Amino acid sequence: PLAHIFRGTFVHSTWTCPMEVLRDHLLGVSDSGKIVFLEEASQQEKLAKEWCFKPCEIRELSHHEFFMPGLVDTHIHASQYSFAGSSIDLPLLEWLTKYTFPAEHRFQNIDFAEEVYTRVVRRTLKNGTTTACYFATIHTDSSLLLADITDKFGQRAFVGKVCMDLNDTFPEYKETTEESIKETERFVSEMLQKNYSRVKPIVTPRFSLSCSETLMGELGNIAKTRDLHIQSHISENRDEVEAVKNLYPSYKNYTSVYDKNNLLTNKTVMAHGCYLSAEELNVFHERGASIAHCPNSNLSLSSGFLNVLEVLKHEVKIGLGTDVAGGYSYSMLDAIRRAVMVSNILLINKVNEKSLTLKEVFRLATLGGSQALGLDGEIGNFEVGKEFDAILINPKASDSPIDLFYGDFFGDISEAVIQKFLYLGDDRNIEEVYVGGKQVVPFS
Amino acid sequence: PLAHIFRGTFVHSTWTCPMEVLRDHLLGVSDSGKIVFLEEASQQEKLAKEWCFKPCEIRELSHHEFFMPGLVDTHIHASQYSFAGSSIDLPLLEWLTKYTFPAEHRFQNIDFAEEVYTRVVRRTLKNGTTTACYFATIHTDSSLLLADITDKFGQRAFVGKVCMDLNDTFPEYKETTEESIKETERFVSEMLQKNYSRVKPIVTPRFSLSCSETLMGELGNIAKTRDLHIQSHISENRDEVEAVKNLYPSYKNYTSVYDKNNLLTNKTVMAHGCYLSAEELNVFHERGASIAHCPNSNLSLSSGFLNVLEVLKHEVKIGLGTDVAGGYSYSMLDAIRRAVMVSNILLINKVNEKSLTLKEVFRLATLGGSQALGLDGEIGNFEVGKEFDAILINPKASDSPIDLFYGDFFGDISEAVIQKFLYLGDDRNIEEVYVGGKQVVPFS
Ligand SMILES: O=c1[nH]c(=O)c2nc[nH]c2[nH]1
Ligand SMILES: O=c1[nH]c(=O)c2nc[nH]c2[nH]1
Ligand SMILES: [Zn+2]
Numbered sequence A, B: 001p002l003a004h005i006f007r008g009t010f011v012h013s014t015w016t017c018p019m020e021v022l023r024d025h026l027l028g029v030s031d032s033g034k035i036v037f038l039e040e041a042s043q044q045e046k047l048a049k050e051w052c053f054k055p056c057e058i059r060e061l062s063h064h065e066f067f068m069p070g071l072v073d074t075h076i077h078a079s080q081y082s083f084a085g086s087s088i089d090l091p092l093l094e095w096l097t098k099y100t101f102p103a104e105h106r107f108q109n110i111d112f113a114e115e116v117y118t119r120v121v122r123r124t125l126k127n128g129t130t131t132a133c134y135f136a137t138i139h140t141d142s143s144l145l146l147a148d149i150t151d152k153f154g155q156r157a158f159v160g161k162v163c164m165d166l167n168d169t170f171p172e173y174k175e176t177t178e179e180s181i182k183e184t185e186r187f188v189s190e191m192l193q194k195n196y197s198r199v200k201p202i203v204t205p206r207f208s209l210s211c212s213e214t215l216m217g218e219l220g221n222i223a224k225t226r227d228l229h230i231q232s233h234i235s236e237n238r239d240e241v242e243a244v245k246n247l248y249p250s251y252k253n254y255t256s257v258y259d260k261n262n263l264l265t266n267k268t269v270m271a272h273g274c275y276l277s278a279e280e281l282n283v284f285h286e287r288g289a290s291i292a293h294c295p296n297s298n299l300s301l302s303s304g305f306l307n308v309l310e311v312l313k314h315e316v317k318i319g320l321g322t323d324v325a326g327g328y329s330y331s332m333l334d335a336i337r338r339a340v341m342v343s344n345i346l347l348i349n350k351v352n353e354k355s356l357t358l359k360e361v362f363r364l365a366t367l368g369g370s371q372a373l374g375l376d377g378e379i380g381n382f383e384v385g386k387e388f389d390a391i392l393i394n395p396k397a398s399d400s401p402i403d404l405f406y407g408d409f410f411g412d413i414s415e416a417v418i419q420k421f422l423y424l425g426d427d428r429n430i431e432e433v434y435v436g437g438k439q440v441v442p443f444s
């Protein structure tokens, strides 16, 4: 029989509605993990007959609790979690030399890898991140452990062994071209041998500055021949953009550097995208490539602003990311709030005529990012057929950061309680986390 | 004898150093609430003789815990806490009509006042706000209760009965000029009769748009004759600035409207200040008037950016504020983080050549705001003679939002643990709160 039947309010997004609130509904989850039905509780009779369950098998949620889809982190450096909440005081390129490269260099030690990676998987899960797209480090074996660790905890993920054969400011932390290609192939081969249910390898050129043309082309080939996803960074910072102009002056723009070396495909996510032009956004659209909007990082490192309205105008797929540790928060709730705020910055400065609503950003954090990752057919909202990736919100949880009032339920501020959670909530309101139907939080 | 002797690390600001970290020190607090000494633990012998205490009376902090000064909220609407985390989706003036005025209008009921005000005092205290500068509502009696409630909990505060005799968009929520003046005098008189230790009345014209010249001049007179503090808002939003231009076209600028009606004195705090010119900032400096920088509000309502570097360049006193509910967070930790981020926005856009450091903003949140409120002689840092307004931080508290690593204490990221708390901490890391020497959190 069914693994779960839930009764209560369900808050999710569709392609035509940024936030649909489905009150007093019944959702059934199969033994395999799929949403098997979702209907008004009025159908409890017809559904108990169909699906052969007794009413005492229904779990009824508290009247002030709601389920929402698990949050989808489309860009996060697992290997930088050690110093997250720290060190956001140099712009990207100097930041990388001083903090990031020495940090990821520690991962040659596999026992150090185990500590940091165990903490970020658990930390991100307890904050409702059910799917993470991870940058690991250049070390295949330590990166393989990250995959093993996400499997062990039941997080859905892409794990990416980072490829870098150029590193002038910290030459200790790099590979040769040959080594980088051979180790990517070993990483992918050993990942696929594990046959994990929901952790996949992702082809991870660090970015143009770190990768020769040979490296980039070959990584594009591994992606194509093996039919794999690609992640990298693009156009985050102005000095980065100039530094690519001067390292790669034969290419019209940053997007072209990747495009012509076969690293801009329809399974490609690119972090940041702040200085992509309209023409570059057209090519993303044409290639089917996605952007991870990382607004905390973009403010914290003084990089810039992604104009998300324009990305949507161009019909480029887009999710939200945390980008730990350039963005200091591990929480996709922070990513949501920061995304709202950055859309407000562009309104204040008269770049756009409107800002983004909280519900639209909620949709980016869940359904949008599921699409940025090509996983929108299995996750991102509550559609029959989909995996049950879900977080249970109780805004009146023990020690809750939220104060609820009678007016939040009976006054004139529409979905006041959902808003209070999205703006003020933390992991204390996230009572239960589900991935693929199984309860992964609380931890055993 | 002494009420407390603490041993451990103390993190605070001075006028010459944004963040001074004082490791393994001894701080003594008198029975009256004052810091009576602060020295290296090497002086334990000499101090035990002087101050006549036995070593077993010293409380030794955990090796990973630190004391810092209580956070000073220089601008917060107590009466808007009911909908905080909600409704930040209209710019200031439409926001006021739709949410704020109907909300504050509820405070004619004194039992509704008691609920909301009890929650915000407690909530802000558990998040380390030891001093709040509160806007209440136009009702003197409900505002008197807020003063009573802050006294009961041991929060240091200014409580301000709001004055408004103009309100076109919501005429139900206003006073007559006569009523507003008489009720301010009753409010101040009944406050002073209570002889509270650390809750004071503050003269609170809502802002120019809400107050006639007669009202403003008379409130300036009550402030002068009674020697009281003044709070109001200034130049938050561009339509506000134009709306004052057209309501008050005989005055050179917004600052002049207040200045010429005696509401810009050396006990004056003005919220926001986003569109103050350099010349207006000169007058603030000359008058000794302060600004409450409310960056969450300024982003959330799409108002603008206060250029804090320029305010400091002009030597205008400045603290940070929460501005609940236009800014959605009740936490001065959020205020700090948002202030950092707004200084980054102005760097990204090339308005300034630098941004503000986290330590400078830490200094604004504690010492700066104590000065914005004219209370820098009694609070804001750990100087002998000062009140013991202090919060105990444990970053390894139960269910802590922070993951600490060996590298945070022994690596190359300077005060990595303090940073992690300032960026990622919440009320779970705030084990104990002290105001005037007495422990006010945990609550009895
Ligand atoms: O935010 C970022 N974090 C990184 O580690 C990195 N490497 C290249 N580009 C990057 N951007
Ligand atoms: O942020 C604000 N909140 C308010 O309630 C208000 N009233 C006038 N001006 C204001 N600004
Ligand atoms: Zn990144």
Ligand SMILES: [Zn+2]
Binding pocket: B075, B077, B233, B271, B323, B326
């Ligand atoms: Zn205000």
